[PDB]
Amino acid sequence: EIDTILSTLRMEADPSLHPLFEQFEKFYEEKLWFQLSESLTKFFDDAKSTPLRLRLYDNFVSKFYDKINQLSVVKYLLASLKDSKDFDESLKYLDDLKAQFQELDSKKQRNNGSKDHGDGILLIDSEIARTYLLKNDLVKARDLLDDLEKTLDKKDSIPLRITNSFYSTNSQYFKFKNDFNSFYYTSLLYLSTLEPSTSITLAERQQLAYDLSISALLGDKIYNFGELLHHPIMETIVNDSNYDWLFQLLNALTVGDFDKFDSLIKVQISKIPILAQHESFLRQKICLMTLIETVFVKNIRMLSFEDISKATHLPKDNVEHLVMRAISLGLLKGSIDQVNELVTISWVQPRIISGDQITKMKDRLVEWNDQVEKLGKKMEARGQSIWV
Amino acid sequence: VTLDITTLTIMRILPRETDPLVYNMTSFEQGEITFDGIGGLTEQIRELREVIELPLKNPEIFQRVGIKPPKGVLLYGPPGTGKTLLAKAVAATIGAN
Amino acid sequence: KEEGKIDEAADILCELQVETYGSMEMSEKIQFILEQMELSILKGDYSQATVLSRKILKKTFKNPKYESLKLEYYNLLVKISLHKREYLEVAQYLQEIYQTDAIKSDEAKWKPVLSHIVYFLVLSPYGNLQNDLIHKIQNDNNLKKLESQESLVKLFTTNELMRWPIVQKTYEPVLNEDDLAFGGEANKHHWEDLQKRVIEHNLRVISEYYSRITLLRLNELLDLTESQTETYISDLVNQGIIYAKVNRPAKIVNFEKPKNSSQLLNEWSHNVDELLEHIETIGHLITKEEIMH
Amino acid sequence: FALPFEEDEKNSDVWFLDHNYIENMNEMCKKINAKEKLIGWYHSGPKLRAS
Amino acid sequence: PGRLDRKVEIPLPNEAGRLEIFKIHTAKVKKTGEFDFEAAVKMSDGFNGADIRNCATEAGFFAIRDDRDHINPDDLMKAVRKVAEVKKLEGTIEYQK
Amino acid sequence: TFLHLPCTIEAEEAEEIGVEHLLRDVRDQAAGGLSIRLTNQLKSLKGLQSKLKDVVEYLDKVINKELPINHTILGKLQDVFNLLPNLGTPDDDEIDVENHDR
Numbered sequence A: 001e002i003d004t005i006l007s008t009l010r011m012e013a014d015p016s017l018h019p020l021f022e023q024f025e026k027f028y029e030e031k032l033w034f035q036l037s038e039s040l041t042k043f044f045d046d047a048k049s050t051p052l053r054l055r056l057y058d059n060f061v062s063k064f065y066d067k068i069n070q071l072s073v074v075k076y077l078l079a080s081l082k083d084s085k086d087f088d089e090s091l092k093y094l095d096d097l098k099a100q101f102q103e104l105d106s107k108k109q110r111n112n113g114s115k116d117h118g119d120g121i122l123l124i125d126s127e128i129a130r131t132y133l134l135k136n137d138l139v140k141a142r143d144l145l146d147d148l149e150k151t152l153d154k155k156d157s158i159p160l161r162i163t164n165s166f167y168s169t170n171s172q173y174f175k176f177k178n179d180f181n182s183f184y185y186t187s188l189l190y191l192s193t194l195e196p197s198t199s200i201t202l203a204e205r206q207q208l209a210y211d212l213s214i215s216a217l218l219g220d221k222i223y224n225f226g227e228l229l230h231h232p233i234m235e236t237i238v239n240d241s242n243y244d245w246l247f248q249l250l251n252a253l254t255v256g257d258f259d260k261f262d263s264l265i266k267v268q269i270s271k272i273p274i275l276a277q278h279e280s281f282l283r284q285k286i287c288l289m290t291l292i293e294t295v296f297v298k299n300i301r302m303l304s305f306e307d308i309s310k311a312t313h314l315p316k317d318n319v320e321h322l323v324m325r326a327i328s329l330g331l332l333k334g335s336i337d338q339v340n341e342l343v344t345i346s347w348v349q350p351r352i353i354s355g356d357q358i359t360k361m362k363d364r365l366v367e368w369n370d371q372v373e374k375l376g377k378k379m380e381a382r383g384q385s386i387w388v
Numbered sequence B: 001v002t003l004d005i006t007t008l009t010i011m012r013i014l015p016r017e018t019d020p021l022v023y024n025m026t027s028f029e030q031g032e033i034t035f036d037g038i039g040g041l042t043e044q045i046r047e048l049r050e051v052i053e054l055p056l057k058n059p060e061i062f063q064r065v066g067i068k069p070p071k072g073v074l075l076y077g078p079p080g081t082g083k084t085l086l087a088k089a090v091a092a093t094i095g096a097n
Numbered sequence C: 001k002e003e004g005k006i007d008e009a010a011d012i013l014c015e016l017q018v019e020t021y022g023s024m025e026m027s028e029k030i031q032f033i034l035e036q037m038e039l040s041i042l043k044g045d046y047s048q049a050t051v052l053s054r055k056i057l058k059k060t061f062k063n064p065k066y067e068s069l070k071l072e073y074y075n076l077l078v079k080i081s082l083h084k085r086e087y088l089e090v091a092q093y094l095q096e097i098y099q100t101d102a103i104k105s106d107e108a109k110w111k112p113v114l115s116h117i118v119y120f121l122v123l124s125p126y127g128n129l130q131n132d133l134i135h136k137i138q139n140d141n142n143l144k145k146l147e148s149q150e151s152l153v154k155l156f157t158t159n160e161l162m163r164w165p166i167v168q169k170t171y172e173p174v175l176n177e178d179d180l181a182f183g184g185e186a187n188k189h190h191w192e193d194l195q196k197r198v199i200e201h202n203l204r205v206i207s208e209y210y211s212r213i214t215l216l217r218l219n220e221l222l223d224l225t226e227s228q229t230e231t232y233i234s235d236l237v238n239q240g241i242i243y244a245k246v247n248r249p250a251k252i253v254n255f256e257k258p259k260n261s262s263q264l265l266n267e268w269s270h271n272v273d274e275l276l277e278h279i280e281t282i283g284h285l286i287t288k289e290e291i292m293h
Numbered sequence D: 001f002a003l004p005f006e007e008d009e010k011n012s013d014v015w016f017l018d019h020n021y022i023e024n025m026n027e028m029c030k031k032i033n034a035k036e037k038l039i040g041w042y043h044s045g046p047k048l049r050a051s
Numbered sequence E: 001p002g003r004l005d006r007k008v009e010i011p012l013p014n015e016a017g018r019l020e021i022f023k024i025h026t027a028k029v030k031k032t033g034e035f036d037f038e039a040a041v042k043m044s045d046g047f048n049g050a051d052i053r054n055c056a057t058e059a060g061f062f063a064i065r066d067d068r069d070h071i072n073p074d075d076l077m078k079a080v081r082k083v084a085e086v087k088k089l090e091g092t093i094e095y096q097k
Numbered sequence F: 001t002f003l004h005l006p007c008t009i010e011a012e013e014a015e016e017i018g019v020e021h022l023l024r025d026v027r028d029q030a031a032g033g034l035s036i037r038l039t040n041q042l043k044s045l046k047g048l049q050s051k052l053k054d055v056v057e058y059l060d061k062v063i064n065k066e067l068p069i070n071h072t073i074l075g076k077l078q079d080v081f082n083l084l085p086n087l088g089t090p091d092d093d094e095i096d097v098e099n100h101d102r
């Protein structure tokens, strides 16, 4: 019955994969499908070049799929149909899988009397949306994704798996469109909803890390460069050639530093043609961030244009243009005076976290803590008719 | 309005109670009657258009001259004339409510 | 119409059949009215033509039956407002065509009308309500299916500085292709009115962003000379779009307002309250992270 | 109104909440005022525990 | 002045105005074919359109006496002689102000 | 995690009468004369003093003990600094004209 299914795939398979097959016979026979759910999940890590896995999953889709969590049917299948680069085939199989879950659920909600099976339907819509994105039918996925969004907001008891599939899919949509800002924030939402459970690979970490860094550089309102640095994802891979510069570019922006930043930018024109037409953008961007850092870090809030001029290595004419661009973008609110030659800022959007920024805030409260304490004695003492 | 008998405070709106008679006629259109469907009062339909129909389409000409656009028509004549029927025929042309 | 007696002939049709009818059909009647309006366009009496439009009701074109005459009704009106260089009115008339289902539904047919709408909204002067109307089109997704139109419009929707010589050079070959807003012969001289709007935009943006500026700086910002700068500000004070004080020896121009003692300390009233508000919120968030973490 | 409740501070993954009592109290409380329905639970403090 | 400014007088339907009024009414009720309208108008001289509506009813009464659901030409002749006496006696040629 | 909702406390006019007269004190929910309003200024300032201290301390314990970072706290407290008044500005000069008037 299953005997043919497992025996054929052995020959096709690498020898080092032979035991796995035999372990699938074994936990069928024990009638213990707890260990089976783990074994299938494991299979695609060791065999992601070969779609031996997809053919294997077919048998188990139609057998246990209420006698195993449905969460686990979505986890092993996703690796198989994502990396399938025949996407007609992907759509067709997923739609038939959805029809089986819609029949099943009506009797089984009262029959088990402990389990749910409506959870599974949402996730299939997410996989269906991903297949459309790769296929390059970006609009078809997005309107599927919007209807799915509605359902999710009206539930509050939904698994942590559901949110993880939905945000991943939404990120891929903004990466096709190349909306840098939109990508950055929705990929941050994937990172949060990450599960210790297998629903990631080793490949995916390194590739989100590349795409995040690139988006960040080219955002129009990002200043979450320090937030990325401190994050695990980008921390571990800096020792490879691709992610070496990529780290040092991200680092030179965080710190406002021009000597390291400009030296990197020369290399990347030749190296990467993506960053050979954003050359103008990246130089305006470092200067823009530094501008907010210099006035703010001081306890005087109003600052002459001259000091900015040597700092952003630009003359006075561009200083005013930098300042104007920020206000437009809704990053600062304030005034420009070329009469008094002053920039007087009065609203700031949140700064990067760093220990030393913390230190400068903590020292700044000290100054005015003294005044409250000394005044609190004067007023108390004074008054002889406080309740007389 | 509707107000408590416990604290004499207006709690909530009471939308105004429609008076049935005038309300029935606002709701549905009383039209059309045809111009050549009325016989012998045919002149008197036209004469109404000059008073009402002209300044309604364009207040714009009356405003050029500066003389006020003219309104107020008293309908009279022995009963059964069908002047209430003519009220409908005038406003049937304009499609007026 | 072939003949020179188009003057004479224009007049015949308009006198007689302007008067009402009591036994003629509306379909037949409208068709002559458009004709009468077209002839009033050809003569150069647009004062005639504006009356003829409203002597047929706007409410007899909102049926599917007179959906064909809806396209015509709004086509002839455009031209009447277009000659009297009144651009606010042209834009609305064209948005009725766009919303017409035949134009909206077909891919090709929507393109010529939508480019017209954009052109006239941008040549309209920036009102209060103007911002909302250009930001409707902005929200449209069929704005996104042209790229000439896309780049052009976004510049003025958003508050941002964009120099007159960059517009003059770049957008001359792009927009002279489409006729009757920049490539007509009567509308060639609407490139002069492109210049007035960009710089007028430039002055409104600058009003927010500066509060005092020298006149010498401002000549670079608009790229206009000293004489031109002072003059174009002074008219804006008469149309009541800004308040500025303009110093005639080429000194300084201040786009800011005379204030009162009271008003300025109202902002301090708010900064102090909001600062305090933060100290209250902060106080219970600290305790929360203290116990739990 | 009070609910029956216990806690053991050794392991806070241990506590006693009565399942009978809530239903019975809700039924009674719908009679006295029409205002009354369960909209949360109070804690007696003194702090916000992660428990 | 400024409330009513124009006065439109409504008179009676004329000798060929009275003619049209018959036509609307006959259609409105049931009939078996009638054509006597050229004579009936002379009999009905000086009638309001209210009394032309009453006459059709009058013929309607005569017919249901012969046990017919459709108005005969013969009834319409009978109807108009009856209405006519009654019209003069309770007669009104009056104008209201 | 748990989102603070601020509180001010309220009662219907049914309950409130019994509260006002049962109370047999000065009340922090009502006030009398000028004398009580001098009290209020001392009490209101004392609350600021204590509350500021908690903020500094929290900043200390983040860089010493090394409790995890919160950009909710640090972000809100970033705003406080730009909202901050300073001295020597034309604004303070407008306060002094009003102090002479009053």
Ligand SMILES: Nc1ncnc2c1ncn2[C@@H]1O[C@H](COP(=O)(O)OP(=O)(O)O)[C@@H](O)[C@H]1O
Binding pocket: B037, B038, B039, B041, B078, B079, B080, B081, B082, B083, B084, B085, B086, E021, E024, E048, E049, E050, E051, E053
């Ligand atoms: N011109 C007419 N054409 C057809 N029916 C008419 C005409 N004039 C009068 N009538 C009839 O007389 C009836 C009564 O007229 P109505 O409008 O109620 O009148 P009034 O206010 O003058 O009493 C009408 O409903 C209609 O049947």
Ligand SMILES: [Mg+2]
Binding pocket: B083, B084
């Ligand atoms: Mg009447």
